[PDB]
């Protein structure tokens, strides 16, 4: 609720903007009058709350800068009686890699259910683990949102029997080993020209399924998720 009020307040001022303490004054006054013109929604805010919410917004790239101003590809965040909780004002904690993998897996699973898991992970990576705004664009239009991820054997001149490239597993394994081993598996695609294909890692797991390859792929996904979360370090 505090964030939505903030974004409306900062949307109202165009490029004129407001000072940081000016924005604080406006949001504090609004909450003092209360977003209630209700009781289900509305506790008393503090400057710490304003600074925390504007930190989240800055992390979402919605505010730019002593000057503070509104804004219009970037990073995202993990995003993971009543008076009893409300009185407890405070809320950073430290995560472990096992917990990180668990939360990332749960999030990708739930967003996949909201709309197959492999395509879900591929699209989430395509947006750099971005918000569901990518899904919002998908609901607006599939085609460009899909295009964001772009969703004798020729390579092995030795002949053998039999994205639109059903090549033998030898050259596919060679390409996958080269990419993963060189730590360049980011944005993997079909080496045949004009074949930008969003790779389902399970299909890539079919290309090569080495136990060291599994460790490399897991470490790579961990690094990629960690580097694209606005709050992680």
């Amino acid at each position: 609720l505090l964030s939505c009020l903030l974004v409306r307040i900062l949307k109202a001022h165009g490029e004129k903007g407001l000072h940081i303490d000016q924005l604080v004054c406006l949001v504090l006054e609004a909450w003092q009058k209360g977003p209630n013109p209700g009781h289900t929604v509305a506790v008393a805010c503090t400057s710490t709350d304003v600074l925390s919410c504007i930190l989240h917004l800055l992390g979402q790239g919605y505010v730019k800068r002593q000057i503070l101003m509104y804004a219009a590809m970037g990073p995202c965040r993990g995003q993971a009686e009543a008076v009893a909780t409300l009185a407890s004002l405070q809320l950073g904690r430290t995560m472990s890699p096992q917990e990180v993998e668990g939360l990332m897996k749960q999030t990708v699973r739930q967003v996949q259910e909201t709309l197959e898991p492999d395509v879900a992970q591929h699209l989430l990576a395509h947006s750099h683990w971005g918000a569901e705004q990518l899904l919002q664009s998908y609901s607006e239009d599939p085609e460009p949102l899909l295009l964001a991820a772009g969703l004798h054997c020729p390579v092995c001149v030795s002949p053998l029997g039999c994205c639109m490239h059903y090549c033998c597993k030898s050259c596919w394994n060679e390409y996958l080993t080269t990419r993963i081993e060189q730590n360049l598996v980011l944005n993997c695609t079909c080496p045949i020209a004009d074949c930008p294909a969003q790779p389902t890692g399970a299909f890539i797991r079919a290309i090569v399924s080495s136990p060291e390859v599994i460790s490399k792929y897991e470490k790579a996904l961990l690094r990629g998720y960690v580097e694209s979360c606005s709050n992680l370090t």
Partner: protein
Amino acid sequence: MLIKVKTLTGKEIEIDIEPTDKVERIKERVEEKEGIPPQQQRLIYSGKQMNDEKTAADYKILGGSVLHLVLALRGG
């Protein structure tokens, strides 16, 4: 007829509707307990965004079927 709306975290809200209710009416009933202007709310059903003008009967919505809420602050 009573249906459900699920936010992103997982919190569920239960709202009774009528076949002639508009998507704007549903958004109003949601913000009754959420206090979020409809400019920021978006409704998703079967992977399709709910058209605000349309009626709840247009999408053939039945009871219990969860219309997934999603936030959109930038827009509005």
